[model samples]
Target: GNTIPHYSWFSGITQFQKGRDFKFSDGQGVPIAFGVPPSEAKGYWYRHSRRSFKTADGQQKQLLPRWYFYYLGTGPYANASYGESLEGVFWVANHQADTSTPSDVSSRDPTTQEAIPTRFPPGTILPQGYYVEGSGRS
Candidate 1:
């Protein structure tokens, strides 16, 4: 079940508009990458700031990647759960789709499958909690 399935979740943007999109790869180049399509899936994914951390190979890669792939679970807990599947498709705007062996993606989870571009690549000051933090209620 942990196989990259054919999914149509993809989008692209030549240039990122400030009040709309966030830089996926720092200030390297344009923001041409997979994006999420409008759907009735209920919850949404937020392209938060990238997280800096060392890779599994002991490589010092600061900007590895970060995002909020949120999903409203089947219960009353309004909070979104954070997770990604290894069997899901790995969509990269610049790079091709990868569904290779386990050794290729040894830096991720194995239970769940992964999906990319689950939503428009953008960040909003409003969190799920509704009230903006540190804004003094603006």
Candidate 2:
């Protein structure tokens, strides 16, 4: 029920090569879904909780949470075969949806009805003043 029904665009043909400039014509945001083989449904992507690890010197270190993909019958981090590819296969919704929620809240997938613990959902269009270049790493 938390899912916001918004417009979602497929990340067409573009590859995420480092240091290269790229933009999404419709604009970019957090990736919500990924295309997979016909044998499987689209992969749903989500951000997991921040984790703390012990450093070699016994100090605790925490890194920013990482994005992960999930699909039926596969581990959360299942690789390429399950549509783990990020470039052309991914889909992005407007980041504006992300701004409205509190850290303790979670978004939901409209179709699967699954809980997206963090990040935005599909169909969330870019709000005024925010454009493609403002979205993610260039």
Candidate 3:
């Protein structure tokens, strides 16, 4: 169903800027904007982030090379029931985009794929729900 079939998604940052362009990766480097043409579909493969813990072989292994592929996504919440697939591309910028809309945002890993920049890359911030573990919001 998905372009990459079944890519894993974890967490990441959504950088934006006063220039009105949305950023993705950490500020260390220039952001990788959504250079791909919107109408065309893209393919990608990725590895799991170092943040993940895995077994060496079967049981006692630690985090291994996490990889995944890419596919043009319809957008996040496409399948609202399951919460699979996602929106946006990935990039890096010194500033934040005025809006961090997931669909418009970008990241190191492909959209709807495994978590790559497992948070805090170059001291970036992902404005997702998990950050706020309080009340009144998600």
Q: Give the lDDT ranking, best first.
A: 2, 3, 1
What TM-score would each prediction reach against the true structure? 0.23, 0.24, 0.21
lDDT of 1 by residue, 2-87 (tens): 22122212221112222333323311212222222222122323333333457689886432222333222311222433223133
Candidate 2 root-mean-square deviation in Å: 16.1
Q: lDDT tens string, model 2, 1-138?
A: 222133122221222222332233222434444343222223334433344578689897543323343333333332333334366344322323332221221234446542323233354343332222212211
Top lDDT prediction, candidate number: 2
- Taking all chains together, the TM-score of candidate 2 against the true structure is 0.24
Give the number of the best model, judged by TM-score.
2
Tens-digit lDDT string for candidate 3 (3-93): 2233333322222221232223434222132443322322222222333334566654232222232332323322122223233334222
Candidate 2 deviant stretches above 4 angstroms: 1-41, 54-58, 72-138
List candidate 1 stretches off by more than 4 Å: 1-39, 44-59, 74-138
Model 3 bad stretches (over 4 Å): 1-31, 36-59, 64-96, 100-138
Which candidate, 2 or 3, has the higher TM-score? 2
